[PDB]
Design a protein around this ligand. Structure first.
Ligand code: THP
Ligand code: CA
Length: 129
């Protein structure tokens, strides 16, 4: 996999972000994670976490996996990096997302996110408390 440049247009929620990619606006949905909706418990916390992370970053990068790059809703499907730190991983580490939507061909970072989930779980962080 390879990292590609992109620019923040707007935070949306815990697992969706609007980005300028190859000069086109696109909604990106984070691979391999599920944050609660804004209206659910830890929803505002998940949204705030992602918001801070992408807004404070100097450099946003997009990394597609080996399978589909767009979902049935026309959302980009990617790992998103903020100053080299993967947003998908950070949410799971913090207990602000569950590992989820793991489909074959788009699962390069599965083991890495499952490690993070195991540590959030042992620490009973947020969703695991
Ligand atoms: C993360 C992800 C979601 N999706 C689709 C499946 C779900 O659609 P259906 O429920 O219609 O089957 C939806 C969940 O997204 P949200 O968690 O953003 O709601 O997005 C993919 O198709 N591939 C993916 O990698
Ligand atoms: Ca969600």
């Amino acid at each position: 996999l390879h990292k590609e440049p992109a620019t923040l247009i707007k935070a949306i929620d815990g697992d969706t972000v609007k980005l300028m990619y190859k000069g086109q606006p696109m909604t990106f949905r984070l691979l391999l994670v599920d944050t609660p909706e804004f209206n659910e418990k830890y929803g505002p916390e998940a949204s705030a976490f992602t918001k801070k992370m992408v807004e404070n970053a100097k450099k946003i990068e997009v990394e597609f996996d080996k399978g589909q790059r767009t979902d049935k809703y026309g959302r980009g499907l990617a790992y998103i990096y903020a100053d080299g730190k993967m947003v998908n991983e950070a949410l799971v580490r913090q207990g602000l997302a569950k590992v989820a939507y793991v489909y074959k061909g788009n699962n390069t970072h599965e083991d890495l996110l499952r490690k993070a989930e195991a540590q959030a779980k042992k620490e009973k962080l947020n969703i695991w408390s």
